[PDB]
Each structure stands twice: as structure tokens, then as C-alpha cells.
Amino acid sequence: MSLGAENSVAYSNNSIAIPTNFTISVTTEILPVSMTKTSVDCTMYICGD
């Protein structure tokens, strides 16, 4: 598997890169918060009636 695209940054002692524009990016983050609340009747489960 490839880790990523190969990019070589043009580093020099007196060159800088300044952005001239922008992108407003909206991204989604999905986080679980709660689970199903379960209750078990121990006697009924093990023995029933």
C-alpha cells in the first residue's frame, strides 16, 4: 500500500509561500454518545418460571 502522494516542499533560506485565497471547508465528525439501556431479570433469565 502507498502511504501517500509524494510531495517535496521547496524549502530555501529566503523563500516563503503566502496564501492568496481561502476555502471554507465544512467537515463532519460523528461521535457515539450513549448506548442502549438494558435491564436483565437474573432469576427469569436463568430459571424462567
Binding site: 502511504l3 509524494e6 510531495n7 517535496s8 516542499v9
Partner: protein, 50 residues
């Protein structure tokens, strides 16, 4: 032992539960590594004159 396996089958899906739990841990470890190290999608390189 075939007899042991036949007796083991009476206990149900314990073996399936254990395999599923270990498989979850195994995929989780790879996920941990991706979260920590694979945070860039470009493989940057240093200039030759360091």
C-alpha cells in the same frame, strides 16, 4: 481431540465470542497506528541541502 470438540459444542457460542473480541482488538491496534501516524496524506521530503 474430536470428542473434546463434540463436548465443546454444547457450550454454545463462547468460541465465537472470544474470536470476535480478539478480532476487534486486532483491528483496533491497526486503527490506533493510523490515528497516530497517518495524519498527513502527503509524504513530505526534506531538501537535499539540509
Amino acid at each position: 481431540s474430536t470428542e473434546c470438540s463434540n463436548l465443546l459444542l454444547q457450550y454454545g457460542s463462547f468460541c465465537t465470542q472470544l474470536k470476535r473480541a480478539l478480532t476487534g482488538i486486532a483491528v483496533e491496534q491497526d486503527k490506533n497506528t493510523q490515528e497516530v501516524f497517518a495524519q498527513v496524506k502527503q509524504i513530505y521530503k526534506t531538501p537535499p541541502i539540509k
